[PDB]
Each structure stands twice: as structure tokens, then as C-alpha cells.
Design an enzyme around this catalytic site. Structure first.
Site, PDB file in Angstrom:
ATOM      1  N   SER A   1     -72.833 -34.865  83.398  1.00  0.00           N
ATOM      2  CA  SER A   1     -73.884 -35.612  82.713  1.00  0.00           C
ATOM      3  C   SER A   1     -75.263 -35.395  83.359  1.00  0.00           C
ATOM      4  O   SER A   1     -75.378 -35.344  84.581  1.00  0.00           O
ATOM      5  CB  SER A   1     -73.535 -37.106  82.693  1.00  0.00           C
ATOM      6  OG  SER A   1     -74.417 -37.833  81.857  1.00  0.00           O
ATOM      7  N   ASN A  74     -64.136 -53.238  73.666  1.00  0.00           N
ATOM      8  CA  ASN A  74     -62.729 -53.352  74.052  1.00  0.00           C
ATOM      9  C   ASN A  74     -62.516 -54.342  75.185  1.00  0.00           C
ATOM     10  O   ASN A  74     -63.247 -54.313  76.175  1.00  0.00           O
ATOM     11  CB  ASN A  74     -62.176 -52.002  74.496  1.00  0.00           C
ATOM     12  CG  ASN A  74     -62.279 -50.931  73.424  1.00  0.00           C
ATOM     13  OD1 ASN A  74     -62.054 -51.193  72.247  1.00  0.00           O
ATOM     14  ND2 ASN A  74     -62.600 -49.697  73.842  1.00  0.00           N
ATOM     15  N   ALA A  80     -57.512 -51.496  74.901  1.00  0.00           N
ATOM     16  CA  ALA A  80     -57.678 -50.156  75.476  1.00  0.00           C
ATOM     17  C   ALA A  80     -58.988 -50.034  76.260  1.00  0.00           C
ATOM     18  O   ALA A  80     -59.613 -48.970  76.261  1.00  0.00           O
ATOM     19  CB  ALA A  80     -57.615 -49.074  74.383  1.00  0.00           C
ATOM     20  N   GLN A  81     -59.405 -51.112  76.923  1.00  0.00           N
ATOM     21  CA  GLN A  81     -60.610 -51.067  77.763  1.00  0.00           C
ATOM     22  C   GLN A  81     -60.390 -50.087  78.916  1.00  0.00           C
ATOM     23  O   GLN A  81     -59.416 -50.209  79.651  1.00  0.00           O
ATOM     24  CB  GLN A  81     -60.970 -52.465  78.299  1.00  0.00           C
ATOM     25  CG  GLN A  81     -62.270 -52.521  79.091  1.00  0.00           C
ATOM     26  CD  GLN A  81     -62.621 -53.928  79.562  1.00  0.00           C
ATOM     27  OE1 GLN A  81     -61.882 -54.885  79.314  1.00  0.00           O
ATOM     28  NE2 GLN A  81     -63.762 -54.061  80.228  1.00  0.00           N
ATOM     29  N   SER A  82     -61.294 -49.122  79.079  1.00  0.00           N
ATOM     30  CA  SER A  82     -61.073 -48.030  80.040  1.00  0.00           C
ATOM     31  C   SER A  82     -61.814 -48.191  81.363  1.00  0.00           C
ATOM     32  O   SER A  82     -61.525 -47.489  82.317  1.00  0.00           O
ATOM     33  CB  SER A  82     -61.474 -46.690  79.420  1.00  0.00           C
ATOM     34  OG  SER A  82     -62.830 -46.719  79.004  1.00  0.00           O
ATOM     35  N   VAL A  83     -62.797 -49.084  81.404  1.00  0.00           N
ATOM     36  CA  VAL A  83     -63.563 -49.348  82.618  1.00  0.00           C
ATOM     37  C   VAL A  83     -63.871 -50.838  82.614  1.00  0.00           C
ATOM     38  O   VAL A  83     -64.308 -51.366  81.592  1.00  0.00           O
ATOM     39  CB  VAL A  83     -64.885 -48.533  82.682  1.00  0.00           C
ATOM     40  CG1 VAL A  83     -65.702 -48.932  83.892  1.00  0.00           C
ATOM     41  CG2 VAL A  83     -64.610 -47.026  82.719  1.00  0.00           C
ATOM     42  N   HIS A  87     -68.898 -52.618  77.962  1.00  0.00           N
ATOM     43  CA  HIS A  87     -69.465 -51.486  77.211  1.00  0.00           C
ATOM     44  C   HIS A  87     -69.548 -51.789  75.726  1.00  0.00           C
ATOM     45  O   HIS A  87     -68.539 -52.161  75.113  1.00  0.00           O
ATOM     46  CB  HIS A  87     -68.607 -50.211  77.371  1.00  0.00           C
ATOM     47  CG  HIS A  87     -68.709 -49.540  78.705  1.00  0.00           C
ATOM     48  ND1 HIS A  87     -68.386 -50.172  79.889  1.00  0.00           N
ATOM     49  CD2 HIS A  87     -69.046 -48.267  79.036  1.00  0.00           C
ATOM     50  CE1 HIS A  87     -68.534 -49.322  80.893  1.00  0.00           C
ATOM     51  NE2 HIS A  87     -68.936 -48.160  80.404  1.00  0.00           N
ATOM     52  N   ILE A  88     -70.699 -51.571  75.102  1.00  0.00           N
ATOM     53  CA  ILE A  88     -70.666 -51.448  73.647  1.00  0.00           C
ATOM     54  C   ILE A  88     -70.660 -49.965  73.246  1.00  0.00           C
ATOM     55  O   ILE A  88     -71.588 -49.222  73.584  1.00  0.00           O
ATOM     56  CB  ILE A  88     -71.845 -52.182  72.979  1.00  0.00           C
ATOM     57  CG1 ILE A  88     -71.858 -53.645  73.416  1.00  0.00           C
ATOM     58  CG2 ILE A  88     -71.715 -52.133  71.467  1.00  0.00           C
ATOM     59  CD1 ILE A  88     -73.100 -54.391  72.971  1.00  0.00           C
TER      60      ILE A  88
HETATM   61 CL   LIG Z   1     -63.931 -49.349  76.914  1.00  0.00          CL
END
Ligand SMILES: [Cl-]
Ligand SMILES: CN1N=C(N)c2cn([C@@H]3O[C@H](COP(=O)(O)O)[C@@H](O)[C@H]3O)c3ncnc1c23
Lengths: 101, 112
Positions: A1, A74, A80-83, A87-88
Site C-alpha cells: 500500500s 461486520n 466475519a469481522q477480520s480486524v 471498519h466501514i
Molecule cells: Cl471487517
């Protein structure tokens, strides 16, 4: 990034591209305040939460999502929240399907 | 009246209401895509999220807090998803702003 992958920043939030995009346009709005999950936001976060949605909406416009888009938040394993930081997701540039996962 | 949600708000169309106050209403989706699926809608008739303005900042935050509280009350402690659809590509079909809250099953990725 790269630094240019930060699309917007102010005292309250940051907006950046998702490096694992699920649509032609896919970016992320986060608060600088480390709210870990939306289920753990509190009443004091009300203005901040409103601010995040307006910024999502403005960035969507700035990114050419005039024909439509989807915002996703999420929570937890089932979401399925990944962090574990709020986050939106903003996804656009293709036809979003239904159900949303 | 712009949409069928106007009938739910004025109570001429009976809905399964979970929560109400002066700024919003919460009710179950009649075509649920998960074991728990309800909608959080403002009483102010913003047609879509792309048409919200800065004066709506407090209301928007309130809608999200009401989503999260109702999720808790519905027993979604193992997790859930919040969804807002805008326009044709977002698959929006009712043109009155609303947050979907889905839970009670594993939600997949991508989100549609
Ligand atoms: Cl997420
Ligand atoms: C009484 N009534 N009538 C509908 N036509 C009707 C449609 N819907 C839901 O409204 C949602 C609209 O979401 P978008 O497609 O994102 O606009 C869908 O999930 C529909 O199933 C409803 N939810 C509660 N009560 C409803 C309806």
C-alpha cells in the site's frame, strides 16, 4: 500500500483502499479512536459514528459511485469481522448481490 | 408518500416493531435473509444514504447505536452484519434510508 491509498483523513478518521478488494471500488473508513467492534461503541460515540457514515458517503461520491454502492459493518465471528477495529466497508463499481453474505 | 415504509411509520400497516423513539423505528424484515433480520429506519424520510447531509450527523450516529443495542437485545452476541444499500448497484429497492441488521448464522464473504 502507498500513501496515496489514504483517500481522506481528519482529526476523527481515516479512509483507505482495501488491498483485498471485493469490488472494482472497495475502501475502508475507520475511526482514529480504537473502537474494537460496533457492538462495543457507546453513547459518547454518537457524533463520531455519524461522522464516519457521512465520510463514507462523501468518499463514495468522490470515487464515482453515483450509480450505487453498499456500506458494510461486520461484528464478531458470525459477521466475519477480520480486524478488531471498527471498519466501514464501501463497495461499488459492480452490481451488488442479495443476500449480502 | 414515497414508500411502503411510510405506512409502517404511520402504523396503517402492522409490523413487528422491536423499538421506537422520536427519531426512529425498528422492525423485522418480512423477507429475512438470516434467522434474525431487522431494519433500523429514521422517521425523517431521507430516501438514501447518498442524500444525507451534514445536519443528519447526529441522527445517523443514533441509527447505528440503536442498531447495536437492538442486536444485543436480539441475542446477536456471537456477531452480526450491518448493511446499507444505495441505488441500483447497491441493490436498494425501498427508497427510504435503513440499516439492515443480520445475525444468527455465519455471514459469508464477499457481502454480496
Ligand atoms: Cl471487517
Ligand atoms: C410490510 N412490508 N412490506 C414490504 N413490501 C416490505 C419490504 N421489506 C424489506 O425491505 C428491504 C429493503 O431493502 P433494500 O432492498 O436494501 O432497499 C428488503 O429486505 C425487504 O424484504 C419489508 N420489511 C418489513 N415490512 C415490509 C417490507
Amino acid at each position: 500500500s502507498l500513501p496515496a491509498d489514504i483517500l481522506y483523513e481528519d482529526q476523527q478518521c481515516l479512509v483507505f483502499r482495501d488491498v483485498a478488494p471485493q469490488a472494482p471500488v472497495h475502501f475502508l473508513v475507520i475511526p482514529k479512536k480504537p473502537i474494537p467492534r460496533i457492538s462495543q461503541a457507546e453513547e459518547e460515540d454518537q457524533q463520531l459514528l455519524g461522522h464516519l457514515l457521512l465520510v463514507a458517503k462523501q468518499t463514495a461520491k468522490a470515487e464515482g459511485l453515483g450509480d450505487g454502492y453498499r456500506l458494510v459493518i461486520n461484528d464478531g465471528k458470525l459477521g466475519a469481522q477480520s480486524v478488531y477495529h471498527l471498519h466501514i466497508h464501501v463497495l461499488g463499481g459492480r452490481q451488488l448481490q442479495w443476500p449480502p453474505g
